[PDB]
């Protein structure tokens, strides 16, 4: 079931695999591409993880008073782990910090066993936020996805000594409080919305590896971004939510039959 790669006159076999999982709204999709290369003295295997985590942005309030629940940083960790702490996470992309809102880019493999940053190509949009890839090592990436600011330019430190910080605020005279936050149509899809990950990685493995895990953890930090009246204008005040969400998945590496595993 394997399918030959060619590369200078070199060969080695590859196979494919993937599984999907997913709990209220948020999904993960890991993909992989294992080589089995006779020119290298490891084995690889490329992961592709594709997902989706709700923004879950919700509104409240009343005539004098609002409160926008949204998504301030979306948190992807990816784990590696297995009983000898033989497999190792080689590299994995995104890398450092983007802030361009289409990310997008390769991790190559070279028959031999050179992993460069047979292919896994990583596309995304993160209008208003970016990427920071905040560990890299052996057994973790980890990834966060931050807000930066709004089009017209207001962050989670604006501070006006009127209006407070005017964040997401519709009109500083107008509107009730639960009718006064930025309408959807005007927000980046990652609040109104959610966001949907696509990050990279390859893992090396010892040539006789049987199985290893990769842990998914999906964490999504809120803010509430709160209105309120004060006699003439709106005032507005950003702070970090009491709550924030998280789910994982484990998946089994199959090095042995070449299979992605979801662990129900
Ligand atoms: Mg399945
Ligand atoms: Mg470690
Ligand atoms: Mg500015
Ligand atoms: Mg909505
Ligand atoms: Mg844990």
């Known amino acids: 079931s394997g399918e030959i790669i060619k590369e200078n006159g070199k060969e080695a076999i590859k196979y494919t695999s993937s599984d999907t999982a997913s709990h209220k709204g948020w999904k993960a999709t890991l993909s992989g591409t294992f080589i089995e290369d006779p020119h290298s003295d490891k084995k690889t295997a490329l992961l592709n993880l594709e997902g989706f985590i709700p923004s879950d942005k919700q509104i409240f309030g009343s005539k004098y008073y609002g409160k926008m629940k949204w998504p301030e940083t979306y948190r992807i960790n990816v784990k590696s782990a297995d009983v000898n702490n033989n497999i190792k996470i080689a590299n994995s992309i995104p890398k450092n910090t983007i802030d361009?809102?289409?990310?997008?880019?390769?991790?190559?493999?070279?028959?031999?066993?050179?992993?460069?940053v047979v292919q896994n190509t990583i596309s995304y949009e993160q209008p208003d936020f970016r990427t920071i890839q905040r560990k890299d090592d052996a057994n973790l990436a980890s990834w966060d996805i931050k807000f930066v600011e709004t089009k017209d330019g207001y962050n989670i430190d604006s501070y006006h000594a009127i209006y407070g910080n005017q964040l997401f605020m519709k009109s500083r005279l107008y509107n009730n409080g639960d009718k006064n936050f930025t309408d959807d149509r005007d927000l980046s899809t990652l609040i109104s919305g959610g966001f949907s990950?696509?990050?990279?990685?390859?893992?090396?493995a010892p040539k006789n590896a049987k199985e290893s895990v990769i842990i998914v953890e999906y964490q999504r930090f809120d803010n509430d971004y709160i209105l309120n009246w004060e006699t003439t204008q709106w005032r507005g005040t950003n702070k970090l939510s009491s709550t924030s969400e998280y789910n994982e998945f484990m998946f089994k590496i199959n090095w042995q039959d070449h299979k992605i595993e979801y662990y129900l």
Not at 101 to 107: A, G, L, P
Not at 197 to 204: E, F, G, S, V
């Open 197 to 204: 990950p696509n990050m990279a990685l390859a893992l090396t």
């Open 100 to 116: 361009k809102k289409d990310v997008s880019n390769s991790i190559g493999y070279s028959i031999g066993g050179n992993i460069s």
